[PDB]
């Protein structure tokens, strides 16, 4: 560093946009070499994504074949006195969805003269997604047809749920009206599929099956996820999950006048909440949970609990590391950010809702059922039209609730506004939770998924206190593994994770705004969006490299809602069941054989 | 249709992986014409990212020039009785970082015979990002050198923080002890830059400036953000932000034997929290927040609060819509998911920590300062080595806190474990919060950012109750627009938003784990991480398309931490101050003209 | 084939223009690899001719 050399050295502004092809970073990759690999990888993902080919998003035929759009979403639009849509008005809504243009959509007629309720984001599915699977490129199953047998059965489930809102889950085994609901529901031959939970003999046990799914763990122990019942800690604030829930004994839209005013977009009945907050203990509380939440609220609570319990510290490669722990990759930050991103901001649900299916809501179905039994000529199945057991119970509730008008067969709603003003199929809640939780299950892994949820609880009947949960004979509680790998009879994390999506998705059904299918196949769609993200990300992570040493490369091995086992590997290969596959996951019914 | 046609019709299975070039979707784009445009946009984003070029991430010089690595991070590795790293253990740590290989890193030596504290993710900055700005491709400034005049002014700010931990923010204007600090700090000619707050004259006002930043609104009204004091609603559960904070008058690593055990990676003294939970109202509370948080906790609280008040219902295109609201794009779902994704999983902070800078923590410098005044030779500025006003206070604190041992000048830590086992520069908390709130300000917009935060409150000094906040002469509370569109005097959303990132960032300093630089520059790193993601996403959004009709295309118009106005448009175009720029944002000091 | 899975299976029209990346053909080449090789060869001819 000679006298002259020193005297000659110069400097310049070091700026954010300055470029340095040479720098002293402690990194086995050069500056330009790191950028290139990141570049190639991004191209690969875009090509790979395109190679999947367009999804078979096919309308079920109802819109072309049912008279005056009675099978279609048109809430907040102009209707006649029977709630049939002004056809021009619906035509203008189609122009809106078609166009994906915000100014066109603003021309869609409202059903009241002013302050009418807004369409919830009819442009929402049309965006070109930077990463993950594009808005129109995750499959969901076709919804059942308006006139179908299985739709009647689903509407019957929702009426039953409405009738049982206030009955604590604790007393389902011994309650008379829940037994009646069960017998009634088993009488429907078309009520299978849709992750419906039955016992070993094929019946619907009131305590363990009614209103639940058959996803692994959902029908073991209590209806309510341990995660919806535990204390969680946020920023050192210790929070008991007592919520200002919906008030017992109130229903809405129990008369043609209140129902029709809603269908047109007019001001709702005042929704009312309790004064003293309570734990979740009945169908109305699940309805409340799904009404008062906001995207990842429930999933955020659940990951906070999982951290607090220190279970995620044992997951992934660092589960075997004596000297290190992950944070930004295969540690806490990664887990919590990947969880939130996992649902692709609910955009697949929006594409399916508007561009594809445009399905009517259960409160709209109940309108037709009301007017079929009393003005209209829609050939709904005899299984619901002549179901006097259910229909007598339904009209009594409406009478008590509507100020004494008899023979009204509308779906009593748990909130004054009824459903959100967007189509019924699929549920956005179901996409969101389906995804968030898939992500959690993936990072936890199958094995740690079998670990016992420590100190299980259930709410008392008033929801003022929690009681310890202890397995008995009926419960369906299997083996789990404790902090010591020491086997116990108890609830598993995997099982309790499935219940969170199950409680939220089926909560929307208790609320009166969704059929089972919207939540069940909705959760599938979310599970697929999450898996697509996980797959894209995995290969670029440091811990995805195959290296020399005791610690092996990262992979995600876990179990889907359907129960089939999936294992995700870095190089876009995955195991599905006993099958090896390559490329981007589309669903559990599909596999491009690996070779 | 015909008998024959009907009879010949065939079906096949409808699977998730079936392909349909034709389908009856109600969409102006065909199935192939949608996939292509999406493909084209991904390519374009990838090419634009490549085009920015490799960032000038340049090591300080300390690692080449300071002897026995005394300016570098090596917590949890072996040391001698003076905290000097075993040089062979440090080489192995660099092999670990260089290799980005999990199994190499499992061979970095531990400073204790068994059970030692683990390295926090030295691989974490090596990931190849699917989107946004790649892991190594966000700029942060170089950290000040070990021997710089400004590093010592920063250490001195951290020592003062330690000494002022139990003093209620509301009493800062009148407190004698708080005066001492303010005077001592203005004494450093070097204490400028780093978003340091000062009044109309170049003075550090004890009440409105000390331990604050000069970001718009930060120095107005109360220290603590409204968002960290309001109730929030999660899933129907109403939460009062009363936290089991850290216990008063209780410091850690106040002796050489405790501090060294820690630097060697051994079991920490037990950190104690209060039995009855309190609201935030002093430095030790902000330290607690910053220790007890988890990634987007604070930001989640804040967006929940903004939703509750209905302020996001007014923002963006749908703010002008009579017939529609947004949700998945330019509404609630977009806002909350983009908020969380904005920090790129903290990975920019991680690359800078390990691959670039490898900066020691404030507690490690404290140990240098201690062995300098008493066993060592590193030439630290005399403006700290001879700062007897500050040095007396420090040994008093330590002496009142260890067994009564005199003349230790170690930094008194707020938690038993000291800092996390990762380097100091920048702060992960800062990039995280820097990003989240940037997203929040972008979606809110500048105009709505000027709106009055309703019913402002502060804690009482006990931490047990809230009191209405009332503006008075010397609050620097400015103008805000109310719910009727008339101008009031009161706190703005933007100011209160900024306080959130300030509270958490500076929170880590009150904790004793970061200098100002880590937080202030780190916050700017998070801000760019966030803007880069917003830019990439914007062009592809439905409301970003140019349409005919009264409602205009979407854009993000707001103001940076540094106070410079930014406007992001769909075409990867953006306005920075008065300049029209093109391409991807790197910082407010750089613009490729349009 | 459980009761639930059977009840959930769906069909769609099988048309001349339907596309299937997986099909049960007794063929050592996959559908896409067959199209790819044919594609690469057509380009080779065009290049070779030019
Ligand atoms: O927001 V929903 O699609 O669950 O009615
Ligand atoms: O996790 V930190 O870099 O804010 O100590």
Among the listed residues A205, A169, A204, A207, the one whose alpha carbon sits nearest the alpha carbon of residue A187:
A204
**Which residues in chain C are closer than 8 Å to A590, comparing Cβ atoms?**
22
- Contact, A144 vs A157, CB < 8 A? no
Three-state DSSP class for B78? Answer: coil
All chains having 3 or more CB pairs closer than 8 angstroms to chain B: A, C
Eight-class DSSP state of B320: G
Q: Which chain B residue has its CA at the smallest distance from A347's CA?
A: B328
Domain ranges of chain A: 1-595
State both tokens at B251: 């410091």
Q: Give the separation between CA B494 and CA B558, rounded to whole angstroms.
A: 9
- Contact, B233 vs B308, CB < 8 A? yes
DSSP string, B477-499: --EEE-TTS-EEES-BHHHHHHH
Q: Is A500 on the interface with C (CB under 8 A)?
A: no
State both tokens at B322: 């009579």
State both tokens at A159: 């009426």
Instruction: Tell me whether residues C18 and B13 touch, CB distance under 8 A.
Output: no
Instruction: Tell me whether residues B124 and A331 touch, CB distance under 8 A.
Output: yes
In B450-572, DSSP assigns E strands to: 457-459, 466-468, 479-481, 487-489, 556-559, 565-568
B420 ligand 2 Cβ < 6 A: yes
CA-CA-CA-CA dihedral for A468, A471, A477, A479, to nearest 10: 90
Q: Give the separation between CA A1 and CA B158, rounded to whole angstroms.
A: 38
State both tokens at B501: 């990132």
The closest-lying atom of ligand 2 relative to the alpha carbon of residue B427 is 3
| Count of other CB atoms within 10 angstroms of residue A75 | 26
- Cα–Cα distances (Å) from B387 to B153, B162, B185, B369, B382, in that order, read 11, 16, 11, 11, 7
Helix and strand numbers (H, E) in chain C are 2, 1
Among the listed residues A188, A97, A191, A195, the one whose alpha carbon sits nearest the alpha carbon of residue A141:
A195
For A171-205, letters b (16+ CB in 10 Å) and e give ebeebeebebbbebbeebebbbbbbbbbeeeeebb
Count CA atoms within 13 Å of residue B320 on its CB side.
Answer: 12
**CATH class of this structure's domain B1-594:** mainly alpha
Count CA atoms within 13 Å of residue A581 on its CB side.
Answer: 24
As a residue count, chain C comes to 50
Rounded to the nearest angstrom, the minimum Cα separation between B39 and chain A is 6
- Cα–Cα distances (Å) from C12 to A414, B10, C9, in that order, read 37, 8, 11
- Contact, B287 vs B246, CB < 8 A? yes
Give the Å distance between the CA of A351 and the centre of ligand 1. 13
H or E element: which one contains A467?
strand A466-468
Q: Which chain B residue has its CA at the smallest distance from A59's CA?
A: B24
Three-state DSSP class for B568? Answer: strand
**Which residues in chain A are closer than 8 Å to C3, comparing Cβ atoms?**
192-193, 202
Q: Give the separation between CA B590 and CA B55, rounded to whole angstroms.
A: 12
Among the listed residues C14, A385, A53, A249, the one whose alpha carbon sits nearest the alpha carbon of residue B11:
C14
- CA angle centred on B514, ends B510 and B519, rounded to 5°: 95
Dihedral pair phi/psi, residue A131, rounded to 5°:
-140, -170
Helices B516-538/B493-510 angle, 10° precision: 140
Residues paired with residue A325 on neighbouring β-strands, in sequence order: B120
DSSP string, A337-398: HHHHHTTGGGHHHHIIIIIII-BPPHHHHHHHHHHHH--------HHHHT-HHHHHHHHHHH
Q: Give the separation between CA A479 and CA A334, rounded to whole angstroms.
A: 30
Whether residue A422 lies in the annotated active site: yes
Residue C22's Cβ-count burial label (10 Å; 0-12, 13-18, 19+) is middle
| Count of other CB atoms within 10 angstroms of residue B279 | 22
- Cα–Cα distances (Å) from A469 to A238, A450, A457, A458, B491, in that order, read 22, 18, 5, 6, 48
| Count of other CB atoms within 10 angstroms of residue A390 | 22
| Count of other CB atoms within 10 angstroms of residue B189 | 10
Pairing of strands A573-576, B573-576: unpaired
Q: Is B12 on the interface with C (CB under 8 A)?
A: yes
Three-state DSSP class for B72? Answer: strand
Among the listed residues B480, B316, B469, B381, the one whose alpha carbon sits nearest the alpha carbon of residue B155:
B381
DSSP string, B234-285: ETTEEE---B--BPTT--BS-SHHHHHHHHTT-PPPPP-B-SS-B---BHHH
Q: Nearest CB to A244: which of B14, B238, B240?
A: B238
Instruction: Tell me whether residues A121 and B327 touch, CB distance under 8 A.
Output: yes
Pocket test for ligand 1, best of A352, A421, A422 (most atoms within 8 A of CB): A422
Q: State the greatest distance between any 2 C-alpha atoms of chain C, in Å, as a whole number.
A: 61
- Contact, A412 vs A162, CB < 8 A? yes
Whether residue A429 lies in the annotated active site: yes
Q: Give the separation between CA B479 and CA B481, rounded to whole angstroms.
A: 7
Instruction: Tell me whether residues A118 and B548 touch, CB distance under 8 A.
Output: no
Locate tokens 């993000």: which residue?
B556
Give the Å distance between the CA of B417 and the centre of ligand 2. 13
Helices B297-309/B493-510 angle, 10° precision: 160
Eight-class DSSP state of B553: P
Rounded to the nearest angstrom, the minimum Cα separation between C43 and chain B is 22
B116 ligand 2 Cβ < 6 A: no
DSSP string, A1-22: --HHHHHH-------TT-B-SS
| Count of other CB atoms within 10 angstroms of residue A251 | 23
Count CA atoms within 13 Å of residue B258 on its CB side.
Answer: 23
| Count of other CB atoms within 10 angstroms of residue B11 | 11
**Alpha carbon B493 to its chain's center:** 18
Instruction: Tell me whether residues C30 and A56 touch, CB distance under 8 A.
Output: no
Q: Give the separation between CA B580 and CA A457, rounded to whole angstroms.
A: 60
Q: Give the separation between CA A488 and CA A192, rounded to whole angstroms.
A: 33
Residues paired with residue B575 on neighbouring β-strands, in sequence order: B567, B580
Pocket test for ligand 2, best of B292, B427, B522, B525 (most atoms within 8 A of CB): B427
Among the listed residues B268, B119, B328, B355, the one whose alpha carbon sits nearest the alpha carbon of residue A327:
B119
Eight-class DSSP state of B322: S
Residue nearest to atom 1 of ligand 1 (CA): A428
Helices A516-538/A332-341 angle, 10° precision: 130
Alpha helices in B310-427 (DSSP H): 332-341, 347-351, 362-373, 382-385, 388-399
> Active-site residue among A334, A429, A510, A514?
A429
- Contact, B180 vs B462, CB < 8 A? no
Eight-class DSSP state of A67: G
Residue C49's Cβ-count burial label (10 Å; 0-12, 13-18, 19+) is exposed
| Binding pocket residue ranges, ligand 1, CB within 6 Å | A 419-420, 427-429, 508, 513-514
Residues paired with residue B467 on neighbouring β-strands, in sequence order: B458
Give the Å distance between the CA of A416 and the centre of ligand 2. 46
| Count of other CB atoms within 10 angstroms of residue B8 | 8
- Tell which phi-psi region holds residue A485, choosing left (phi > 0), alpha (psi between -120 and 50) or beta: left
Locate tokens 């709505």: which residue?
B448
**Active centre residues of B (catalytic):** 422, 429
Residue A247's Cβ-count burial label (10 Å; 0-12, 13-18, 19+) is middle
Residues 6 or more apart whose CB falls under 8 angstroms from that of B7 comprise none
CA-CA-CA-CA dihedral for B147, B153, B156, B157, to nearest 10: -140
State both tokens at A418: 């009824």
DSSP string, A138-189: S--PPPPPTT-HHHHHHHHHHHHHHHTTTSBGGGTTT-HHHHHHHHHHHT-T
**Which residues in chain A are closer than 8 Å to C12, comparing Cβ atoms?**
56, 58
The closest-lying atom of ligand 1 relative to the alpha carbon of residue A353 is 3
Give the helix, strand, coil percentages of chain A, each rounded to 5: 40, 10, 50
Helices B176-186/B388-399 angle, 10° precision: 140
Q: Which chain B residue has its CA at the smallest distance from C14's CA?
A: B11
Q: Is B11 on the interface with C (CB under 8 A)?
A: yes
**B559-562 long-range Cβ contacts below 8 angstroms, 24+ apart:** B559/B216, B559/B441, B559/B446, B559/B449, B559/B494, B560/B527, B560/B588, B561/B195, B561/B213, B561/B215, B561/B434, B561/B498, B561/B501, B561/B523, B561/B524, B561/B527, B562/B195, B562/B215, B562/B524, B562/B588
H or E element: which one contains A565?
strand A565-568
- Contact, B74 vs B89, CB < 8 A? yes
Pairing of strands A479-481, A466-468: unpaired
- Contact, B348 vs B525, CB < 8 A? yes
Three-state DSSP class for A61? Answer: coil
Q: Which chain C residue has its CA at the smallest distance from B15's CA?
A: C10
H or E element: which one contains A459?
strand A457-459
Give the Å distance between the CA of A286 and the centre of ligand 1. 14
Eight-class DSSP state of A117: P
Q: Is C1 on the interface with B (CB under 8 A)?
A: no
Residues 6 or more apart whose CB falls under 8 angstroms from that of A355 comprise A57, A97, A125, A126, A136, B25, B26, B27
Pairing of strands A324-325, B119-120: parallel
Three-state DSSP class for B33? Answer: helix
**Which residues in chain A are closer than 8 Å to C31, comparing Cβ atoms?**
none
- CA angle centred on B23, ends A582 and B34, rounded to 5°: 65
Resolution (A): 2.3
Give the Å distance between the CA of A254 and the centre of ligand 1. 21
For A97-111, letters b (16+ CB in 10 Å) and e give bbbbbbbbbbebbbb
- Contact, A335 vs A349, CB < 8 A? no
| Count of other CB atoms within 10 angstroms of residue B297 | 21
Among the listed residues A94, A160, A73, the one whose alpha carbon sits nearest the alpha carbon of residue A425:
A73
The closest-lying atom of ligand 2 relative to the alpha carbon of residue B428 is 3
Three-state DSSP class for B15? Answer: coil
CATH 1.10.606.10 fits A1-595, yes or no: yes
Residues paired with residue A479 on neighbouring β-strands, in sequence order: A489
Cis before B143? omega within 30: no
Three-state DSSP class for B567? Answer: strand
The closest-lying atom of ligand 2 relative to the alpha carbon of residue B290 is 4
Rounded to the nearest angstrom, the minimum Cα separation between B387 and chain A is 33
Three-state DSSP class for B308? Answer: helix
DSSP string, B171-230: GTTT-HHHHHHHHHHHT-TT--STTB---SSS---TTTTTT-B-STTTTSS-SS-GGGTS
Among the listed residues B204, B195, B191, the one whose alpha carbon sits nearest the alpha carbon of residue B502:
B195
Residues paired with residue A458 on neighbouring β-strands, in sequence order: A467
Residues 6 or more apart whose CB falls under 8 angstroms from that of A3 comprise none
Q: Which chain A residue has its CA at the smallest distance from B289's CA?
A: A235
B419 ligand 2 Cβ < 6 A: yes
Helices A256-263/A362-373 angle, 10° precision: 140
Residue A550's Cβ-count burial label (10 Å; 0-12, 13-18, 19+) is exposed
Give the Å distance between the CA of A69 and the centre of ligand 1. 21
Residues 6 or more apart whose CB falls under 8 angstroms from that of C5 comprise A193
- Contact, B563 vs B216, CB < 8 A? yes
H or E element: which one contains A333?
helix A332-341
Helices B297-309/B428-444 angle, 10° precision: 20
Instruction: Tell me whether residues B12 and C14 touch, CB distance under 8 A.
Output: yes
Q: Nearest CB to B46: which of A42, A134, A288?
A: A42
- Cα–Cα distances (Å) from B60 to A393, B84, B285, in that order, read 78, 20, 33
Q: Give the separation between CA A77 and CA A96, rounded to whole angstroms.
A: 13
Q: Give the separation between CA A496 and CA A480, rounded to whole angstroms.
A: 12
Locate tokens 């000040």: which residue?
B144
Q: Give the separation between CA B385 and CA B390, rounded to whole angstroms.
A: 10
């Amino acid at each position: 560093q000679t006298v002259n050399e020193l005297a000659d050295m110069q400097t310049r502004p070091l700026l954010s946009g300055s470029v340095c092809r040479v720098r002293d970073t402690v990194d086995f990759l050069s500056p330009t070499k790191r950028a290139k690999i990141t570049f190639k990888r991004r191209i690969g993902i875009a090509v790979g994504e395109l190679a999947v080919g367009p999804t078979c998003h096919l309308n079920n035929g109802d819109e072309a074949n049912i008279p005056l759009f009675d099978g279609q979403f048109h809430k907040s639009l102009p209707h006649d006195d029977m709630g049939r849509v002004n056809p021009e008005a619906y035509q203008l809504l189609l122009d809106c969805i078609e166009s994906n243009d915000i100014n066109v959509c603003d021309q869609v007629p409202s059903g009241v003269e002013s302050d009418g309720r807004k369409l919830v984001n009819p442009l929402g599915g049309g965006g070109h997604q930077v990463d993950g699977a594009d808005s129109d490129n995750i499959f969901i199953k076709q919804p059942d047809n308006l006139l179908s047998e299985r739709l009647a059965a689903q509407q019957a489930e929702v009426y039953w749920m409405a009738l049982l809102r206030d009955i604590p889950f604790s007393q389902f085994g011994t309650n008379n009206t829940v037994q009646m609901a069960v017998v009634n529901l088993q009488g429907f031959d078309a009520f299978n599929g849709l992750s419906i939970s039955r016992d070993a003999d094929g019946n619907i046990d009131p305590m363990q099956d009614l209103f639940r799914t058959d996803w692994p763990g959902v029908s073991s122990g209590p209806m309510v996820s341990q995660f919806m019942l535990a204390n969680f800690d946020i920023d050192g604030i210790v929070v008991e999950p007592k919520a200002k829930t919906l008030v017992p004994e109130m229903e809405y839209m129990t008369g043609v006048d209140t129902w029709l005013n809603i269908q047109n977009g007019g001001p709702p009945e005042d929704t009312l909440f309790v004064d003293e907050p309570l734990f979740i203990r009945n169908g109305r509380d699940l309805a409340a949970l799904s009404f008062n939440d906001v995207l990842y609220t429930e999933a955020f609570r659940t990951i906070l609990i999982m951290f607090n319990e220190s279970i995620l510290a044992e997951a992934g490669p660092y589960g075997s590391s004596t000297r290190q722990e992950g944070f930004t990759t295969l540690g806490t930050s990664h887990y919590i950010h990947a969880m939130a991103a996992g649902s692709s901001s609910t955009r697949h649900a929006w594409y399916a809702k508007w561009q594809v299916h445009r399905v009517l809501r259960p409160e709209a179905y109940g309108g037709l059922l009301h007017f079929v039994i009393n003005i209209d000529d829609v050939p709904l199945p005899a299984s619901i039209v002549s179901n006097t057991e259910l229909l007598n119970a339904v009209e009594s509730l409406n009478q008590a609730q509507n100020g004494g008008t008899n023979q009204v067969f509308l779906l009593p709603m748990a909130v004054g506004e009824g459903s959100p003003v967007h189509p019924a199929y699929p549920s956005g809640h179901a996409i969101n939770l389906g995804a968030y939780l898939t992500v959690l299950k993936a990072f936890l892994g199958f094995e740690l998924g079998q670990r016992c949820f420590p100190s299980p609880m259930i709410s008392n009947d008033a929801g003022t206190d929690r009681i310890p949960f202890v397995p008995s004979d009926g419960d369906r509680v299997g083996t789990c593994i404790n902090e010591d790998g020491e086997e116990e009879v108890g609830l598993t994390y995997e099982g309790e994770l499935n219940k969170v999506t199950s409680n939220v998705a089926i909560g929307r059904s208790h609320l009166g705004v969704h059929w089972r299918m919207d939540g069940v196949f909705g959760a599938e769609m979310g599970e697929a969006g999450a898996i697509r993200r996980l797959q894209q990300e995995l290969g670029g992570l440091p811990e995805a490299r195959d290296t020399e040493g005791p610690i092996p490369p990262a992979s995600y091995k876990f179990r889907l809602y359907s129960g089939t086992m999936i294992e995700l590997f870095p190089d876009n290969r995955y195991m599905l069941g006993d099958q090896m596959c390559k490329g981007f996951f589309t669903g559990d019914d599909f596999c491009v054989p690996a070779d």
